[PDB]
Amino acid sequence: PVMADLNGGLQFVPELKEFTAKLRKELVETSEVRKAVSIETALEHKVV
Amino acid sequence: YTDFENTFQKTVEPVYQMHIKTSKDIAVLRSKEWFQLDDEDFDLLNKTLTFETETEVTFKNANIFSSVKCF
Amino acid sequence: IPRETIPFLHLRKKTPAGDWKYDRQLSSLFLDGLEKAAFNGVTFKDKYV
């Protein structure tokens, strides 16, 4: 019986769960911060 | 009267309270030029900010201010 | 314990690669606990099992 590993080297990363969580958190925080800043800049521009 | 060049208005705005719950709030505040801090590295997270602003507006016409200052 | 050996009872440690290997430190702690239990006896007061 054979065990083919088609994992793409994903096992070699330390704490893959934490790394993946931090990637998602970084992308999410960037998206929300950019969206909020754009909305507030738009509201300030419209008010002015 | 249409002599808006001689009109001005100084108003003590009501005190405003803002609870900084997340880093999104901090980013929004730092995106504002008017929002300035003596200590730029001040940790605003989990902190309540109170704003006591006064607005001085000089009028260009009935609707549009000729100049707006808020300090 | 002899050098470069695996005791019959040991504790393993998970390596960064994700696989469990014999660990001298944890195994020593467990064997020392076993010796204390064998000689002095081990209490389980206030232990709800």
Side-chain angles (χ1 to χ4, degrees), chain C:
Chain C
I1 185 189
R3 305 176 105 270
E4 203 76 10
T5 209
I6 309 299
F8 287 134
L9 318 175
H10 57 273
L11 302 190
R12 307 187 172 169
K13 184 164 133 131
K14 185 144 96 203
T15 57
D19 80 44
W20 291 82
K21 303 260 204 39
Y22 164 64
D23 196 75
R24 183 112 177 167
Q25 288 50 13
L26 307 185
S27 173
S28 59
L29 180 126
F30 173 55
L31 274 318
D32 296 355
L34 286 192
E35 202 224 317
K36 290 213 302 308
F39 172 82
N40 309 285
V42 55
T43 191
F44 299 118
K45 258 231 180 283
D46 301 336
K47 192 165 283 294
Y48 293 79
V49 188

Side-chain angles (χ1 to χ4, degrees), chain A residues 19-30:
Chain A
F19 187 101
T20 278
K22 156 279 307 173
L23 275 180
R24 214 161 325 110
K25 171 233 70 180
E26 211 98 11
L27 268 203
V28 153
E29 96 185 287
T30 306

Side-chain angles (χ1 to χ4, degrees), chain A residues 11 14, chain C residues 16-17:
Chain A
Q11 63 270 19

Side-chain angles (χ1 to χ4, degrees), chain B residues 3-39 41-53:
Chain B
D3 62 328
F4 298 96
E5 62 270 32
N6 317 305
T7 50
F8 57 87
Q9 174 167 6
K10 183 270 217 153
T11 166
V12 181
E13 301 289 351
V15 177
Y16 290 105
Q17 208 185 44
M18 209 168 27
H19 299 331
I20 314 310
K21 319 272 69 156
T22 59
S23 83
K24 216 209 310 195
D25 295 350
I26 301 171
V28 165
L29 280 168
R30 291 196 178 280
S31 73
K32 301 296 188 186
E33 210 295 318
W34 52 263
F35 182 92
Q36 313 178 10
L37 302 184
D38 302 78
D39 201 41
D41 58 312
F42 187 85
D43 191 61
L44 298 168
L45 192 60
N46 295 118
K47 295 225 188 344
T48 299
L49 300 180
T50 38
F51 304 77
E52 298 138 18
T53 69

